[PDB]
Structure 1
Amino acid sequence: EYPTVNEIPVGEVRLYQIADGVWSHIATQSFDGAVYPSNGLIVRDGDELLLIDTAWGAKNTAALLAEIEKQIGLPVTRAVSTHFHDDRVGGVDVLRAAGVATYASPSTRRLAEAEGNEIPTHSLEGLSSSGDAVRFGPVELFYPGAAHSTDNLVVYVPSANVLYGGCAVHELSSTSAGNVADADLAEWPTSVERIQKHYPEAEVVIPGHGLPGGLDLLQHTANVVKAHKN
C-alpha cells in the first residue's frame, strides 16, 4: 500500500504510518524533465513532531505541513535535513516562515550555501567524523561517512527500530545509482557497512526514494553502487 510515483501528482503529499509515532512523508517532483518520488520522516516527540527532510520544494513542503495538520494534528517544531540537495533542503524557507526550527550539520550547511540551496538555520555539531552519533529528540543522527554525498546523515528511531537512510540508501527495485555527481562511489560500500554494524536491530529501512523494506536495502545499495562503478 506504499504510494508510488504515478499515484502522487506533483504538489500533493502523502503520509504513511511506519510504526507507532513514526511516519514517512512521500512527495513527487520534476527534475531535469523526469518525475521522481521522494521520502522523508516524521517522528512523534511527545506533543510535538520532529521532521526529517523537506518534501522537495516550496509548494510540496507547504502541502506537507497541511497534510500533517490534517492527519496528525501535532505541531512540527524542528526539522533536520540529511544532506544539502534540494530533495532535503528545498522548502526549508517554508518551514522557517512557519516557525519550524531547521537544523543540519555544518557540512550540509556549507554545501547548501555553495550550491545556492536553502540553508537550515542551526548547525548540528558532533557529526563530522564517520561513525559519529548524536541524539536529537526521539531519534539518533548518524554520520556513516561519504556515500551519496559527503555530508549524508542517516536517522534511527530507537523506540521503533526504524532506520531512515535518506539518499545513501536505495530501494530494492533500484537498478541504477541515481545522481552520483556528488557521491563517493568507493567509500559508499564502507559507509553502508558502518550502518549495518551500528544498526543490526533495524526492522524497517526507508530509502530516500521508493519503497521501505528491511535490512536487505543496505546490501542492495552497496551492490547497486558497485554495478555503477563498473
Structure 2
Amino acid sequence: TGDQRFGDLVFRQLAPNVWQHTSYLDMPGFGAVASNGLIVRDGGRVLVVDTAWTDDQTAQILNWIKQEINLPVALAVVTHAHQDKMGGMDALHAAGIATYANALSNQLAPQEGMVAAQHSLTFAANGWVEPATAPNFGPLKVFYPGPGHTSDNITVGIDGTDIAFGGCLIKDSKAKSLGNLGDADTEHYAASARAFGAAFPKASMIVMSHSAPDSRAAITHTARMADKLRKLX
C-alpha cells in the first residue's frame, strides 16, 4: 500500500518531508477506529499536526520521529478538542513540545476532557490564523473555515507541497455519512467545507482524520452531504 507499521501505529509517506500518522482506538466497547494526523519535517525540526488517541500512542509517534527523523519536535498543532486529535497532550508536554490550538479548542478542552494546549491561536475575519499567535510555523498554513464538525475545527495546508489537511471536517469522496455530528453545526458545515477548499485552491492531496488521502472530490462530497443534512426538515 505505502503504509508501514510501527508498534500499533501506521505511517505513510506523502511527500519527501511529510508523513501521515495513524493510530487506532482501543477502548473496550468500540471497534479499532483509525485517526490520522501529520508529521512535517521543516528542515532541522519537526512539526506535528494532531496527537494520537492516547498519551501512549502519542509517545510512540515521538519514538518513530526520534528513530526515523531524529530532529527535535519544535511544535504541535491540534485541530479540535476531541480525543482523536488532543488525546495525547500530556505526552507532548512531558516531552517539552510547545503546543498550539484554536483558542476556542483550549476553552472547550475542560468540558471535553482534554488537556488544553499551551498557546492559543486566533483568527482573522477571513479565517486565516493571526500570525502573531502562530510564530515560526514554517510551512504550516493554518485556516479556520468556520463551524462544521465542531465549532473549533481548524485546518492546515503545507506550503511547498500539494497537501491540505481537513481533520475531521472532511470525509472521503465515498463516505456514507459525516460521522459524529453530536458537536456539529449543521447550518454552517457545508459552507465551512467549501471555505476549506477555497483557502487551499491548489491542494490536490486532501488528508483527513478517518480515511486515506483523497482528491478534491472529498471536499465537494463533504459539502454535499452537509447541505443534505441542513435541508432535512
Amino acid at match of 1:216: A
Calculate percent identity across the aligned residue pairs.
36
Task: Count the aligned residue pairs.
Answer: 225
Question: Which residue number corresponds to residue 105 of structure 1?
Answer: 102
Give TM-score, length-normalised by structure 2.
0.89
Question: Which residue number corresponds to residue 171 of structure 2?
Answer: 170
Whether 1:41 aligns to 2:38 is: yes
Question: Which residue number corresponds to residue 210 of structure 2?
Answer: 209
Distance 1:108 1:24, change over 3 A: same
Q: How far did 1:115 drift? A: 2.0
In the TM superposition, what are the counterparts of 1:38-117 in structure 2 within 5 Å? 38-117=35-114
Select the residue among 15, 19, 24 that pairs with 1:19.
Answer: 15
In the TM superposition, what are the counterparts of 1:180-219 in structure 2 within 5 Å? 180-219=181-220
Q: How far did 1:144 drift? A: 0.3
> Could you tell me how far apart the structure 2 residues matched to 1:222 and 1:176 are?
11
> Could you tell me how far apart the structure 2 residues matched to 1:67 and 1:47 are?
16
Cα pair 1:134 1:142 within 8 Å, conserved? no
> Could you tell me how far apart the structure 2 residues matched to 1:75 and 1:92 are?
17
> Could you tell me how far apart the structure 2 residues matched to 1:34 and 1:128 are?
39
Give TM-score, length-normalised by structure 1.
0.90
Cα pair 2:80 2:152 within 8 Å, conserved? yes
Distance 1:107 1:19, change over 3 A: same
RMSD: 2.0
Structure 1 spans left out of the alignment, 5+ residues: none
Amino acid at match of 1:219: T
Structure 2 spans left out of the alignment, 5+ residues: 132-136
Q: Moved runs in structure 1, 4+ residues, more than 4 A?
A: none
Amino acid at match of 2:171: H
